Ligand binder design. Structure first.
Ligand SMILES: Cc1ncc(C[n+]2csc(CCOP(=O)(O)OP(=O)(O)O)c2C)c(N)n1
Ligand SMILES: Cc1ncc(C[n+]2csc(CCOP(=O)(O)OP(=O)(O)O)c2C)c(N)n1
Ligand code: SF4
Ligand code: SF4
Ligand code: SF4
Ligand SMILES: [Ca+2]
Ligand SMILES: [Mg+2]
Ligand SMILES: [Mg+2]
Lengths: 1231, 117, 235, 59, 118, 58
């Protein structure tokens, strides 16, 4: 049986993957997490595979552990699979050779994603899949959603019968997240294609002590080579098995395929050879140009490996005179990319006709591949014939890109309605778009396509959706730039984004805004927009969805109003059936609360259909006066690079506009001033007590405390109200808390924690503050920061320091940024950061916004993100460099001390040398030296001068999340902390893989609800703190800002100052945890976290042990009993109590017990007078000694492994018994 | 399952070349590192001894609960549980929710009582 | 000064490696283990490199760990190196993309060894090196003990001036463990062939809060592609 | 001895290293079967995945 | 029928015993991240670590399992960091069976552990 | 009449440097690869060589 189904690549292949698999070991990673999360859910729900069994899915610590688990399963006789991508696929490589080597029917479903080189990317291309092309895996590619399903089935069937592992792959995001109405097969149909004899043999040859065998042997040069060729027969037959099933799945669905498929003109002279979702668009362009008489074609490659040349030439037209192979990868240095090379070897080996063959690279990192680009490619063949060209960018540095005429006529099928939606994150737009897909598709005989472009901004971001509808198949695997319907669901975008680009003439444009009058419309709508609305005779429909949404009592949410706009003006369904079929869905969804809520969404539909009246704009718009420019201060980087990017114009940014090594300058987020908050805090100098707690808490540094004297507040606004500093050091100074209304995300934390009964901070509408604050901020921002007035590491004094990390892309009230910010206020000027992959690297390094900044001297955190699994290692590397280099300096300094260096130079040189590793001193004598050696450029001194950036002691930090620390990168973390070296790791524990969807980590508590914890995690929270404390010499400590900022500053001090390994774990609230009262209660929740005893604070300081003192110190008090109310306040716990109350009660009970036992444990750990000692280092002294020297019996074996240059000496190999035994045998044979 | 150190540490270590070579080439360091190891095994034992005599110990449970039927961590959530990022993007995601840019619940509720009109 | 002496391919390259490097993260793996052991020993011994400093070597928990450290040391303006092969090399693939992506002058010295598939093998062949031909590393092959020394030096000298990471490799056992009577170069000589400006610039562009910059961003479809092409001149 | 107790019904995920070298250096196989043909199902995946390899056997 | 299928699964009837072998190099270092995770899975697997306190097979290199003052490659002057307490680290879970043995000291203790752990 | 072309630099693969060592007399050339990529249309060094001739266009 069949079944029309509208879904995306991920769900489409996952549907087939689940049915054909008994075991699955996965690890989350964008954009394959979906599939992995599908399986788990479906299994939990009770889904059955073709064996009537629910899939057994487990989560590992990494894709390496995954691939390893799969191997074991496959070896143990179970049909296994896994879903991965990019960085994840790279860590599976080693196992892949093993899995292929041991001929196992394994199958990988990977969403082709870019590899992180100059920069990380979560978008699609073939860099990863190509990196595994020599693992011995079969590679079957799909070019569409429908194909995703189809090729996914063939993959499994072929694998089972070929005993050769398959890698089914499809374009990440471009196919995986694209939704289309496709056909899927029943689990029964699939199960009936399986080769039973093969399945029986697979299980019979598998590992089992009832009939064991040995795999994974170690072979010498005598047999390795032969054993490696022993599988040739298998690889020769796989192409046949693959074709076989393409024909069998064909007899059931009606969709045929070949290892290589040809499309286009029978006598095409110019053929393209591509692979992936790109082929869909090519064919679209082919149908258009070929119908016009053009002789061009295309060869779709399905099976990339093995690469059967026969099948290639099968789909290749003899009329082909020129054929360009397109690779969606980039192998620096190669003479050509993958596919290109394979194709070349094809013709050369055919040793006959030789058609001009061109090479072309495209789509890197989901780069758009428009029909125009497909046009540019076919023209290059009938023209310049440029080779090794790029398409989609402007290569003005090496000039390899192709000229693209964007004025290319639309090639979408006839009768297709392409739509565009510009919504704000969380307004319902997308969810409403997806509903419009299910409805229309499941009630009409139209094809539906959906794709969405989100924003790097986790809060208040733009979301331009793309939807298409037609009577003919949709092959438009690229954005919509010729829409018939354009809708802006946010009036803010009006004057900041090119909302109407390429909008077809006569096209309708419905806008969301309270400008129902022409006066307002003209006052807020730009001339460029007005001019366009008129010149194109657009059918502009305004609508006050907010007002209309308030009259019906929908809270004011415009999601159900703009949805009604679509069905009425998009023109896909007849007005009647269109609006009618909608009301039917209103009942489908919702209905969560009687007909009351259902009535509010029905009334909205009608009153809206009424409000939806064309805005009769005047013909005077055709020539409206364009305003004048007035952009504030900015760099030539925020102006020439970041803004063009922030304004969705980055694609037009040529190659020459970037750093070859892919680096960015700091403080670029200093001009973003997004201003997407709804409500902001209002300082009230009548209640304020000048404590600096509001600033200390802000997750975006949107609060700037000002401490200046009337000497600096001369040319200031009359409303720059300022109190008079409180305290001793603060007497004549004037205090003030300047709210940064534009950079504020309106989370509410500051006001929520402001001490005084009568809050000195009150939340008010942004617009009712900006006009008076923005100008005061630009002023207060010019007031010198008083850093030498109070103790740098003091609560009230730390906020008088410069925050070198502001306005990041983190969510409102993030539980992470608050910490890092204050961390820069203590060491920022002299620290390195090795940020592990994840949120910490997302809200801090997502181009083009860079929150980290430099202070008044240009000093700031030297930031860097290597990978997700090597944060510690990475940072450990930075530590080795500094050591190696600083030690170098010190040795030259010593040299100069013996030379004829001046008296002054020798003093500072002598001094620095004494405090080389002392922040204060190293900086005191370091600066003196700079002054003294200034201008020097010869001899030792000349070299010592050129190293001023090594003088003051640097501070190396490792930023990561629980996922990194507890899982993927725990191994490196553990190892580095053992190194016993001066490094500082800061773990922001959100108890869950955040930015990837909220997957369960070993840091996730008991009974918590996360991905792969679908019913509350049934394993206790891994105790990372106690595990590392066992080292004895590693400084460990836990913190929780909301509970005690004072203890947090102390920790940072004691940790960073410790002359060795430091591990600090911070309890960070996150939106994945789902706080009932919002992230504005984050600080108050961190507080409860400690009091309840859920997250007890403590510190293990080894140097205390070095002085007879117990290295363990408890910073919190025994549980208070508010634990239950603490867990039930977070949805990640409340959900179970609603769906599975029985397990919920038990799980929350087990947790309380868990924290009750562990605390008593910590207490006794703080009471005991028995602890591990501590010793820095000392000793070394040049000289090495091998463990073999002076040994009586051999210390090494005969093996080629222990063999060394100096080895080979005669020794007692222990084959004559013991020394005594030998001695006695000698006495027992006297003679 | 074993008893407290018997002091044979020195002879034990010196009887093995991996330690004896260090003593022959680095007499000074050797003695310190050997005297250090001895201190480690002595401390770790008393340490291990408390474990054997503690009145507090982590509970245990085979396995249970789970069963059929799953649930998402965002269902019922008052505020958004997923960001605008393409990463947290899922098939079912996309619904409207409070993105925490309006302030805390009580803050919002009181912000209305102070406007009414 | 030219100097005759007998040795295996391993020490021959280690000889150069040590001199030309300042930092090194290493994990043991046959048949390249000999080089890392020599660099470590000579370090303890107190041997000075071209900069007249002892090599700073550390051992990680794995090659994926060594690569991570090797990446950080290079991003921190320090001449780094490592020795690996087969399975070890494969665990370095991820970082190799980063190291070359950030145009760091790293230098890998690998003893070409077979990959574990139908069976394991500590013996030599080009299965490992090839598995990383797309990582963006320049690849220099030496065909004999004498060449192991020469290419080893060229590799370091080129990497420093081109900013492209080099991977010096030679057949495991067949060369790494084949001893011959060859000619090596004093460290002084090797030092005089270094490009001081290139080296000075490597110190400059590197990480340091005194003059910070951000590396390892996350880029969308709008610019990621162009950024990947920005290094075409260097290659 | 471990095989003298569970040998006839155990799977073995052996991490590369001596135990894998003396465990399965071709053509010498130390692990054998008992009078009934039962014996340890030995397999060496890679050096860094011994636990996940065995875990998968468990799955 | 069912019996037909059942019958073909005789090799599954008897409860199997999944074991995992490996030296200290594996358990303490390169494979630790994996061992730690698999152990925390709570499933029925047995891990037997033959602690040699050094990377024997490859030439006796140092590992986190190497003792203080122990002379090994990469520890040319005796290791200057203590032996990693893998045991106490895993014992924090509370739901994992952990034990140390030494045949020379007691064969009875060793057998007792295999019996209990398995 | 035989010869051999030793490849010192495999990456980047400079087609020019390659031909600089290719004797015009060459009528038959066999490329040797010390590896095996199952299913591949050929092994690495080989593939790179073919690309060089197809692009030399002679
Ligand atoms: C080898 C590899 N596997 C997977 C990923 C994808 N990934 C990036 S961040 C992340 C989760 C973040 O987890 P965590 O460390 O807990 O930090 P948080 O986001 O919660 O701060 C995942 C699964 C990757 N980048 N590389
Ligand atoms: C990725 C990878 N890195 C390094 C090696 C090489 N190697 C194999 S065994 C070994 C020694 C560690 O052995 P161990 O587990 O300590 O056991 P032992 O031989 O000492 O009993 C090393 C360095 C490998 N096979 N794969
Ligand atoms: S938290 Fe309140 S009392 Fe404290 S400095 Fe801020 S506004 Fe003033
Ligand atoms: S509401 Fe939140 S983001 Fe805004 S100033 Fe207060 S703490 Fe900062
Ligand atoms: S940690 Fe959570 S709250 Fe912070 S940026 Fe990530 S998803 Fe948002
Ligand atoms: Ca420290
Ligand atoms: Mg997390
Ligand atoms: Mg060992």
């Amino acid at each position: 049986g069949k079944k029309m189904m509208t879904t995306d690549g991920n769900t489409a292949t996952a549907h087939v993957a689940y049915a054909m698999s008994e075991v699955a070991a996965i690890y989350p990673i964008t954009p394959s997490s979906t599939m992995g999360e599908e399986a788990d859910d479906w299994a939990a729900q009770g889904r059955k595979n073709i064996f009537g069994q629910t899939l057994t899915i487990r989560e590992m610590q990494s894709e390496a552990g995954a691939a390893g688990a799969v191997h074991g399963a496959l070896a143990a006789g179970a049909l296994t699979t896994t879903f991965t991508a990019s960085q994840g696929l790279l860590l599976m490589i080693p196992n892949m050779y093993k899995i292929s080597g041991e001929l196992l029917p394994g199958v990988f479903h990977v969403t082709a994603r870019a590899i992180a080189a100059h920069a990380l990317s979560i978008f699609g291309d073939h860099q990863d899949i190509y990196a595994a092309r020599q693992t011995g895996f079969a590679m079957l590619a799909s070019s569409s959603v429908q194909e995703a399903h189809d090729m996914a089935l063939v993959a499994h069937l072929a694998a089972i019968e070929s005993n050769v592992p398959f890698m089914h792959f499809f374009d990440g995001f471009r196919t995986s997240h694209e939704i289309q109405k496709i056909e899927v097969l029943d689990y029964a149909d699939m199960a009936s294609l399986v080769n039973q004899k093969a399945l029986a043999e697979f299980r019979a040859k598998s590992m089992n002590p009832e009939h064991p065998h040995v795999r994974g042997t170690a072979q010498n040069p005598d047999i390795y080579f032969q054993g490696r060729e022993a599988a040739n027969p298998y690889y020769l037959k796989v192409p046949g098995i693959v074709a076989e099933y393409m024909q069998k799945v064909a007899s059931l669905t009606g969709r045929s395929y070949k290892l290589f498929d040809y499309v286009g003109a029978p006598d095409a002279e110019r053929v393209i050879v591509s692979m992936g979702s790109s082929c869909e668009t090519i064919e679209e362009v082919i149908n258009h140009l070929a119908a016009k008489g053009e002789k061009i074609g295309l060869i779709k490659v399905r099976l990339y490996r093995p690469f059967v040349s026969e099948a290639f030439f099968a789909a290749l037209p003899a009329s082909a005179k020129v054929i360009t192979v397109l690779d969606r990868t980039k192998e620096p240095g190669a003479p050509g990319d993958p596919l290109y090379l394979d194709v070349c070897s094809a013709f050369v080996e055919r040793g006959e006709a030789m058609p001009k063959i061109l090479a072309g690279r495209y789509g890197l990192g989901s780069k758009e591949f428009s029909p125009a680009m497909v046009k540019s490619v076919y023209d290059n063949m009938s023209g310049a014939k440029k080779n090794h060209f790029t398409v989609g960018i402007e290569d003005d540095v090496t000039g390899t890109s192709l000229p693209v005429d964007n004025a290319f006529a639309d090639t979408t099928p006839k009768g297709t309605i392409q739509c565009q939606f510009w919504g704000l994150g969380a307004d319902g737009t997308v969810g409403a778009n997806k509903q419009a897909i299910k409805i229309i598709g499941d009630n009409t005989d139209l094809f539906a396509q959906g794709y969405f472009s989100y924003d790097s901004k986790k809060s208040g971001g733009i979301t331009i959706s793309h939807l298409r509808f037609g009577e003919k198949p949709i092959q438009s695997t690229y954005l919509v730039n010729r829409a018939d319907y354009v809708a802006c669901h946010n009036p803010a975008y009006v004057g900041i984004y090119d909302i109407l680009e390429g909008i077809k003439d006569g096209g309708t444009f419905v806008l969301n805004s309270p400008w129902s009058s022409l006066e307002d419309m003209d006052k807020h709508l730009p001339s460029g927009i007005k001019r366009t609305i008129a010149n194109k005779k657009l059918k502009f429909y305004n609508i006050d969805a907010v007002k209309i949404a308030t009259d019906v009592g929908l809270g004011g949410r415009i999601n159900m109003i703009m949805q009604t706009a679509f069905f009425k003006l998009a023109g896909v369904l007849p007005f009647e059936k269109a609006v009618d079929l909608l009301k039917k869905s209103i009942h489908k969804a919702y209905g969560k609360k009687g007909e009351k809520i259902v009535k509010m969404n029905t009334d909205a539909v009608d009153q809206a259909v009424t409000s939806l009246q064309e805005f009769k704009y005047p013909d005077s718009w055709k020539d409206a006066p364009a305003e004048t420019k007035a952009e504030p201060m900015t760099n030539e980087f925020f102006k020439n690079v970041v803004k063009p990017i922030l304004t969705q114009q980055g694609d037009k940014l040529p190659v020459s506009a970037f750093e070859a090594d892919g680096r960015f300058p700091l403080g670029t987020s200093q001009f973003e001033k997004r201003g997407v908050a709804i409500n902001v805090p209002q300082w009230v100098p009548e209640n304020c007590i000048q404590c600096n707690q509001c600033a200390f808490v802000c997750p975006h540094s949107a609060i700037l405390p000002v401490l200046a004297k009337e000497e600096e507040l001369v040319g200031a606004p009359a409303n720059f109200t300022a109190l008079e500093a409180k305290g001793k050091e603060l007497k004549g100074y004037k205090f003030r808390i300047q709210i940064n209304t534009l950079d504020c995300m309106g989370c509410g934390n500051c006001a929520d924690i402001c001490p005084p009964k009568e809050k000195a901070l009150v939340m008010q509408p942004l617009d009712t503050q900006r006009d008076a604050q923005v100008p005061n901020l630009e002023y207060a921002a010019r007031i010198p920061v008083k850093s030498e007035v109070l103790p740098r590491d003091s609560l009230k004094g730390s906020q008088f320091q410069e925050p070198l990390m502001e306005f990041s892309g983190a969510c409102s009230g993030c539980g992470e940024t608050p910490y890092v910010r204050v961390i820069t206020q203590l060491f920022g000027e002299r620290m390195f950061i090795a940020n592990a992959t994840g949120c910490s690297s997302i809200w801090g390094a997502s181009a083009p916004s860079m929150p980290y900044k430099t202070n008044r001297l240009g000093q700031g955190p030297a930031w860097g993100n290597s990978l997700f699994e090597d944060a510690a290692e990475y940072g450990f590397g930075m530590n080795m460099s500094m050591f190696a280099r600083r030690t170098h300096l010190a040795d030259l300094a010593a040299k100069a001390l013996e030379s004829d260096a001046s008296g002054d130079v020798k003093e500072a040189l002598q001094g620095w040398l004494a405090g080389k590793n002392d922040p204060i001193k190293s900086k005191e004598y370091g600066d003196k030296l700079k002054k003294l050696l200034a201008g020097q450029k010869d001899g030792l001194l000349g070299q010592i001068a050129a190293m001023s950036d090594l003088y003051t002691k640097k501070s190396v930090w490792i930023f990561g999340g629980d996922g990194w620390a507890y899982d993927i990168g725990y191994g490196g973390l553990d190892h580095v902390l053992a190194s016993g070296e001066d490094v500082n790791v800061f773990v922001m524990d959100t108890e869950v893989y955040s930015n990837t969807g909220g997957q369960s980590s070993k840091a996730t508590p008991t009974g918590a609800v996360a991905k792969f914890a679908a019913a509350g995690k049934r394993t206790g929270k891994k105790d990372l703190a106690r595990m590392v404390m066992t080292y004895g010499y590693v400084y460990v400590a836990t913190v929780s800002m909301g509970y005690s900022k004072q203890q947090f500053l102390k920790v940072l001090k004691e940790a960073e100052s410790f002359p060795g390994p430091s591990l600090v774990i911070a309890y960070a609230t996150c939106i994945n945890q789902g706080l009932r009262k919002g992230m504005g209660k984050s600080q108050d929740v961190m507080n409860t976290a400690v009091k309840s005893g859920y997250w007890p604070l403590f510190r293990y300081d080894p140097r205390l042990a070095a002085q007879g003192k117990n290295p363990f110190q408890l910073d919190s008090k025994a549980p208070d009993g508010s634990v239950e109310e603490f867990l039930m306040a977070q949805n990640r716990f409340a959900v179970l109590d609603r769906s599975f109350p029985e397990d919920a009660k038990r799980l929350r009970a087990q947790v309380a017990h868990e924290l009750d036992v562990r605390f008593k444990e910590l207490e006794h750990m703080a009471a005991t007078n028995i602890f591990e000692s501590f010793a820095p280092a000392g000793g070394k002294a040049d000289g090495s000694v091998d463990f073999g020297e002076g040994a009586e019996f051999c210390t090494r074996d005969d093996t080629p492994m222990m063999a060394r240059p100096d080895s080979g000496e005669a020794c007692d190999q222990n084959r004559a018994g013991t020394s005594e035994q030998q001695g006695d045998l000698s006495k027992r044979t006297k003679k």
